[model samples]
Structures are given as structure tokens and as C-alpha cells.
Target: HHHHPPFEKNFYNEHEEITNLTPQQLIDLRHKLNLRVSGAAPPRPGSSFAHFGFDEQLMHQIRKSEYTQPTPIQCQGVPVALSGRDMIGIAKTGSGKTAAFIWPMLIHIMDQKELEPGDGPIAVIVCPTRELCQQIHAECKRFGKAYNLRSVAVYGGGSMWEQAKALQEGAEIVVCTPGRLIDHVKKKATNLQRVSYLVFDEADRMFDMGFEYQVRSIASHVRPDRQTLLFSATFRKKIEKLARDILIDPIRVVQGDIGEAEDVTQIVEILHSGPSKWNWLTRRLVEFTSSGSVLLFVTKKANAEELANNLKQEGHNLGLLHGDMDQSERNKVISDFKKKDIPVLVATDVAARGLDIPSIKTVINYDVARDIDTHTHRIGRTGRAGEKGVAYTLLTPKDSNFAGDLVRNLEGANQHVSKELLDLAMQNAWFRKSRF
Candidate 1:
């Protein structure tokens, strides 16, 4: 797979004004965009995508994507990435994180010489779930098609043989789930010796899924000089440790307070009993039905099935997805959800990490999430890219455990903490319990 690249040479920094930016000017720019930067000799922010001087082919995809300007992460991360620097980018979900890394990756690959015999991918992007894998691969193919760049997705729950063959055939970029990629490595279908642009998309979730060993194992295979990027909505302690271990002299870009979603109207409702919560959900489903697509998250698998039955029986056009569903049904549910064949989707947190739908403007939390991080990701489905979205969390007495952390997250994002939630969290103090 060899083609003389036309976009390879156009990536130089052409704007002397930007190149000559004073240290003070960059600090001002970071403040203006509400971004925090900390690294030695990080590149200054760019005003827009045009300032980066991407090839015309890549630029066309940007325009087609309706990106009239750069998001906060892009303004900071793009310049650093194009300069081949390792980075840890922190932004809320749905804040245009994928494009920030993919755009630079394409240019990084194009700058390299053609793939020779027995060559592996020049870039490896790892995520936590199969649905997210498909989402990233679709975007890469859509944009990378302009350069005829090859991309393959390998993930669990898909046919390993097909993925193995795709890997053997070779591609310039491979987006994968950590376990499957490890399987490919064990099967000798792919190697990472040539990979230079390494990306961990949704790095925190990889840790949540206990894939850090797999991720570290995969990274161990890549070239040492490779530029690495880690993107996540919330940067937990484990993520902090991973960043230190993998990234060298890395630039860190913080979009906002780690879990802050500025555009979501966050509401937490405290209910007396389970039946009262049902009334709350059913009454509100009417408003969301005509307003836009809705995503309902449940804590239990059976709850999704039962709630989906109730909604359908009462005449709502909806789709159901859960961990219990096999890969094929999961594929159809996601496809139909995007196509608007079914305007609503009911699922467990299985859809939480990395499943993005631009039209998903409302997220209903039928059950309180297991943790504050889980709640952040669940609600992040909406309010993306400056879109006005609403998130409603229905909380019962059992959910009091999360109220304190919930208030902290709400205060961080500058959302109004409900009085009921505040009172419940206050009760958590009188009886001091072990955090264990």
C-alpha cells in the first residue's frame, strides 16, 4: 500500500506571527479560551483550523464536518500534536476530542515514507468498547478517504478472523479495542514496531474496564520515539499514573474542570418510591419525544428490558440495548438510533463511554450511576459541541450515596445543586463511615 503523498509537505508552520508569539501572549490566549497548559516549550494556541495549514484534502473534510472554528481542545492540542509532541488532553465528552487527534494523525502518517513489506500501521488508536471503535473508524475512513488512507477496526465481539485478515492485509491506521488488538498481536496478525502516532482515546474508560495492562502491553510494542496522546472526559488518579509512565515531556490541555458539561441543563429529582420515579419518567418522556432523541440509562440489565417494554407498550418508538445483547443486535440498535428509525434508546451504561450521537439532546438517568465518573459519562451523551441539551437524574433514597459527590460535580460545572440533594449529602456527615 504505497502512494506518493501530496499533503505531506504542507504541514509546516507558515504564520510567523504565530511562530513568533511571545510567552505572555500564549498565556493570555490560554486564559481567553479557559484552557490550562503546563509543559516545557509547548506550542502556542492557533485561532482556527486554517492556522494549522492542513492539506486541502483534510481541510475539505473539516469544512464538511461543519467545524466553523476550533474547539478549546483543538486550539491547544492540534498545534502540539502537529509538532509531534506527546500530550494528555482533558475535555468533557462530546467536545470534539476525536478530531483533535485524528487530524494530526493523518498528517503524521502522510509525512512518513510509504509502507514497505511486512509493515504495520503507522498509527494505533485504542479505545474501550466495540461501539466506540466503530464510531472512530467511521470518522477516520470518512476523512482519510480523501487521501486513500487505509484504516481497520479490531474489537471484541466481532469476528476475529475478519479482523486478523484485515490486519494482515495492512493499513496505515488501526483503531482497536485493547483485548482484540492483543489477540491480533498474539496471533501474529499485526505488530507495532513501525507505529509512531499512538493514541489512547477515552483512556480513563480503558482503566475502568481493567484494560490498563493490555494498553500498557500494546504500548510496549510501539517505537519509543512515538508521539502519544491520551484523551479523556475525567482524568482519575490511575490515569494520572498512566500518563506519567507513558508520555514524555507531555503537554496537558484542560478544556474545563474535568467533568464539567457547560451546555447541559442538569436536573436531579428525588423520588419517594420506585413507582413515583416511573411517573416522573413517563410524564417527561412526552416532552423529550418530540423535542429530540433521548437516551435512558439504567443500572440493571433487567431494568432496561422492563422499562423498554413499558415504553413500547405505551406507544413510544424506541430501541433497547444492553450488555446482554450480542454484537449484531448492538450494531442494529446503534445504527437505527442514529438513522432515527427509533427516536429513543433505552440502555444500561453499556452505551455510556464513547457512544456519541449528535442528535441525542436529552439523557434520562432512570437510576443513579454507580459513581460520579459514570454519571459524567452518562450525561455527556448530550450537550455536545455547544448544543443545548438536558440531563435528568431520577434519584431515590438508595441513591443518597452519590448525592455528596454529585453536588461536588454539579458545583464544579456551575450547575444549580438541588436543595433535596444538598440535604441528603448533609446527612452523610452526621454518621461518619469508613470510605472503605
Candidate 2:
């Protein structure tokens, strides 16, 4: 006869395979992960989803997806949201923040009674770009299928008729970009009167992109009593003002550094005088061709196109993505890059935030970013979801003004800050303002 240990309730659930760790163990885990969680009546950052008190079906869905552990954002964010309070989440890109809001919002939606016809979407998640909207929709669909719920993604580049039809059929969750969502509003194709949950993903980027008017217009259509959640990689005064305008007694949740990645390896290289910089990049491209997908960041739309053309001429399967590209063209390039058919993508800042591609092994900043914050988001393109990645930034004398901030930014993220970079920053007084 096998001598089995005495059964302990809530210790080891054989049916669910949920292991119960001590409260101290959970605290230790949170600290070990470098999680900085603060809020009124904050929930314990647990080791498993079961600790969050989700329904069994949701737990099954979590297990089905093989998501055994929650990221720092998800751990604290999910519980804060579940408490029926408005939240402001400031986390690094790719910190599993999408699921943090999604899980709580889905739970709230599922608890509500069935809606009547023409009641409109129960939740509206407004994203900054078509790519981000699509990514959020995919995640929503992944978890929503477990409960037989429907989600639809609507953006400017997609079919308007299809989006309208989906809304007409009463999609439970509608993930959309501000412009197209406003378009739907003007055409009377969608309604937000009954929307009980509102989410602004990449809220800062939306404001930077000059979509504040559209976002405010869309928000006006939402019910006053609804819960509003705003997520951004970086929090600024503008974001704070927006939050004050929208959220009611919101709790702020910040994880890791503001808008900076802790897992990425960042490097800065001084480029040659002129055309030699192009040749240096070409050689690096050749090496990266066999590694994985690389996203080359430039400063302007023309530069993106020109760089892609030059690289293509050198026998590279490359694509160009920028704000000027048509919706269909942008979509095609994104699809090709995602599939790895086009291993290299030259882009402007349009692909910086909320564009989640897990396989991006490297981010090449062909041109230095305009500011420290922009640099943070650009380098965030890689080293996502606990993956080790690299970012190479090519600099020149022209970028010396930004050099000081760059050094401090890298130092703040715990990356190496060389003495050469320090001297470069010390050369200019304006740049020293960035020094801490």
C-alpha cells in the first residue's frame, strides 16, 4: 500500500494543479521580480491566477494557454481592476498588461446579465494604432472564446462594413483606434451609451499623435458611471491631465521603471562622417539576417522608404512602415514582418508603442531618437515578455544634444553608461539638464 501524505485543502488541488505558496513566499517572489506595486487596498501579488479568485472556467482558460505565471503588472493590476475601481497603469511595454485589464473587464462583463438588442458593446478598448488594436483583439478573442464571448477590432485600414456589421450584431468587446472609432460614431454605425468599461491603451502615445480631440469626443459618448482604465508606458503631465478629465478616484499602479525595459541590452555606437554609416548598417544587417527579425528605426517617412530601398538593393527582403503609408500597405508590411517573410523592417516612430511582435530579436536605431522618452519606447521594441534582446543605436555629432539624456536613460534602466558617453554629455550645458 502506498503511504500518501495527508490531504491538505487549498494546499495542492489535484484537479486544477494549483499549488498554494505561503504569503511570505509570494512577497519574496514579488520582490525578486523587481515589482513596484502601490495603491490603496492593494491585493497581494500572487504566484498563480487561482490566487486572484477568478472563476473556474477562466482558470481553465489560463491553464489552456499555458500561462502559469503572471507578470508583475498582471499580478497587481488584475486584482486592482477586479475591485470595481478606476485604475491608471504605468508599466513597461510587453509586461502582460493587456491581460491585466482584459481579465478584470471580462469578469465584470461575464457577471452582468445578457444584454438586449442594440445595447452596444459592454466594453470599449481604444488603442493608438491599427496594429495595437488588432493585437488587443487577438488577446481578447483568445480568452473570450472560453466564455463564448465576441470581440471585434476596428481601425481605419480595415473594412468599415464588416466592422459596422460586427457592432450591429452586438460584439461584447470592441477594440478600436480613435480615428476609426470616431468615424463609426459619425456614421451612426456604433454606440457607446451602454459601455460599462473604457480602456485607453497607450494613452500617452494617442495624445502625442494629436488624437486627444477624438479621444475626448469618444469619451463623451461613454456613460459617466463606467469604469475607465488608462495604460501608458510613460506617464507625463499631459497624461495626468487626461486622467483627471476621465478617471474617477483612480488608483495609480506603476511597475519597474517608467517606460523603460529592464530586460533589454542597450548599446550606442558612434557612426562615421557620412555615407560610411550606411555601409556599417549594411554589414550589421547581413549578420542580423540569419538571427531573427530586426526593426530599423529612422527619423522620417522619406528616410524609412530610402533606407528600405537601399537595403533591398543590397539583396535584402525588407519592408517599410511609416505614417505616410496607406492602410493596406502598412497592413501588408506588418503581416510580412510578423510572418518573418520580411526579416527586416524600416520604420518611423509609428511602430514604437503598442506594436507587440514577440519574435523581434533586435531593434536597430538607424537614427537616434528625438528625446529620452522616445528612445525608451524605440528600444522597447525588442526584449519583450521576458525575452533577452538587443538594441543598437547609431549616433553622430548631430545627435550630441540628445546624448546626455540618452546616457542617463540607459543608466536609469541599469544598462552600462560608458565614460565616453558621460564626456559627450558633459560637453553641452543643455544636455546636462538630462543628467540626474
Candidate 3:
């Protein structure tokens, strides 16, 4: 079937730009700040890239590719994932967690290696956003091509007829977002009983968007004997509870210790009671050298557009992505971001999860999310795949209640906003509140 193409055929080009420091260098950086860098750990002793038992054709393709080694999570996560054991992968972005499950799943879904007919989708990976669904579907197609595997991504914001046609093409692997998947299920366009394995990428973030109903309904339709895998940067109680409700005798696979994937440096700024938030934002942008990519997480759709417009007005090239955009436009905007034509992106929680942006060096939470699990995914935009990332969260006096709620949710992992960061946010907040 015709799955979307890879986000970029040149996905490996940026790997050359990183300093290629040793694992010790990465660890040192994280330790200096008491932050645990994701993707820093070496592969488990017995596990190796060779263990994937990849088809010769696929192996040849990956070998020719630029990935030096599997990220710690990939090395450790992919094996169990392929074994049909239900697992929960906890790792930060850029740790190759996406690849960990993807590689093995791809290997299993190829025609010779795939499941039987009427087995429903041999595998289903439910991502949090349409952009991510497209991205992963594209990745699957690119790598799975070596084995002539068939894959399709089902997401909203585009022509359902197009999506329905792709599904009817007899896909071996299906990548989708929760809501769209539900629409298909309700319409009987997707066959869940044949799906033997499932993956919930960005599990925590998916739940944050209130996909609980759709996800649950889809899961209920899947074969009860099938395995379910959950992947996320942070495993909060609610996520755990949801997982427990679905997975059977699951293997709780954790890649790093507490908050390990949050290799990101978190800075909180309480803005002055009066400056415009947008102005404060402009000043902050001036301080950082413009990187190839950034994801600005805002709480509302209107705010995401306003910030994008403001940045554009300032002569900074950027893009805005949110649920409000039509499917085709959403696809195009993500396409632009992947091409690096847009150096900065403004989005809501619904727009950010599972988007594999290797060049993202900064992630800004224009406003703090309502709770901790929400916070984890928002900041997860940067610091992936061994590169350092900086996260900025703007908080105002009015946000104290939300912050408190977040702290309670985080429990012992609680972090406080720094005065320096708060000073900047307060300046930003002044303008935002002034209706500028």
C-alpha cells in the first residue's frame, strides 16, 4: 500500500553536525546539572544491533545509513518489544525509543515474517498526533521497504477517503492517532481482531489529549490475547493505571531511572506582573543562537497562532500547528517543519507528541501544563538522541495553582521555578496580559 514517504530522505544529514562526544561527555554534562541525560546509557551487555535478526536486505540498508549505534533504549527496548511481550518503554526523546520498537516491529511485519491473514493489522502503533503518525508511518515505509512490507498511517485532518483507500490496500502495519482510529473502528473500516501486537508511543501524552475513551474503545476491540506495548518519557500513575487496565501480565520495561529521560535543563520564569508575554519572548529569543528547530508549547490554540504571527512579524521564520487546522494543511505544516524551512514552531499539546525533530535544541512551554505528566511531554521536545536541550516554562502568579497541581502530580520529582527564569516570564506575561 502507499504509505506516506519518510519525513526526509536525508534524515541522517544532521548526525554529522553533532560534536560526536563520548558517552562520558554526555554523562558529565547531565551530572554537572544533576539532570539524567536520556540515551546516555550503553546497550545492555548481551544485547547488540545484531540481535535484531534483521533481514539481510534491511540490515544492509541500516548499515549503509549513518546511525553509529543504537541508542540505549533502542538496544534494550527493541528486543523485548519484538518478543511479543507486553512492555512499557520509558525513555527521553532522541534516545531512539521510536526506533527501538519500530525496527523490531518492522522486521516482524514484512510479508515472509508477518502474521496470518485476518490477523487484523499485524501491528498497530498509536501515536499522539497526526504529524507523528505520518512521521512514523513514513519511517516504517522507508525501512520496511527493504522487505517489501506494507504500511499505512490513519489520522484526521485529511481526506478520509484517501485514508480508507490506504487501509483497504491490505497493510501489514498501521500507524495512527487515537481519535482517527476510533472513527475507523466505529465505521468498521479497520479490523482490530487481526492485530496481534500494539504500540502506544508517547503514551502519557496521548492520554493528556483526553483520548482515554477512543483508546479504550480501540483496545477493547483488539484480540484480548494480543500484546500491548506502551512507550513514553515519563510513566505517571494515571498512565500506569490505564496501562494496567489494558495489558495482560505485562513486562514493565524501564530504560532509565527516575526522570532519566529528562536530560533537558528546565528553566522556569515568573514574568513581571505587567510586560507583554510576546515581548518577553522576543527578548529571550535574542539570547539564544537560532538553532535549526524549536517547539513552543502553548496552552491554547489562539495563543499558538498569536505567537507564530508575532514571530513572523519579527522576521523570524516559523510555523503554527494545532488541532484547528485542516488535515491537509496540518500535513503540509509538519512537512515544512521537517524540511527546516520553519526554524521555530508554535503548537498545542495535541500537536507535539512523537514528532521526531532531531535538530530541536529548545522547547518552550509558553504556559505550564495543568499537571506533571503534561509537563513531561511538553519539555520532551528537545534533548533527544544525546543532544542537549533547554526547556523554558512561563509561569505567572495566576499559574501558582496549576504549578502546585503539577508538583503534587510529580511527587518526589518536584522541581521549582528559578527566579532568573521567572523574571523573564514575568516580563513576557505583562505584554500577554495587556492584550498586545
Question: In terms of lDDT, which candidate is strongest?
Answer: 1
| Candidate that would win on TM-score | 1
Error of 3 at 211 (Å): 0.5
lDDT of 2: 0.75
**Could you estimate the TM-score for every candidate?**
0.57, 0.53, 0.49
**For candidate 2, what is the TM-score?**
0.53
Question: Per TM-score, what order, best first?
Answer: 1, 2, 3
Q: Candidate 2 — worst ten consecutive residues by lDDT sum?
A: 5-14
What C-alpha lDDT do the candidate models reach, one value each? 0.80, 0.75, 0.65
Q: Runs in model 3 with CA error above 4 Å?
A: 1-47, 110-119, 257-436
lDDT of 3 by residue, 353-380 (tens): 4466777778888866856667877776
Let me know the TM-score candidate 3 reaches against the reference structure: 0.49
In order, how many clashes per candidate? 0, 0, 22
Query: What RMSD does each model have against the real structure?
Result: 16.6, 17.7, 17.8
Candidate 2 lDDT, tens digit per residue, 1-436? 3532221111112222223546677567657756655433344555557667777778778888746688878766776677676778887677899999898878778766666887677889999899899889998998987788889889978999998888788788999999998888788787776688899999989999889998888878776667789998887868866775677546677765564434478888776654667988877777776667888898788788788898889988888888876777778888888988888888899654335687788898887777666777787778555466688888776666677667645643556766766677678865553221
Off by over 4 Å in 2: 1-30, 259-436
Candidate 2, 208: how far from true, in Å? Answer: 1.9
Residue 373, model 3: lDDT of 66
RMSD of 2: 17.7
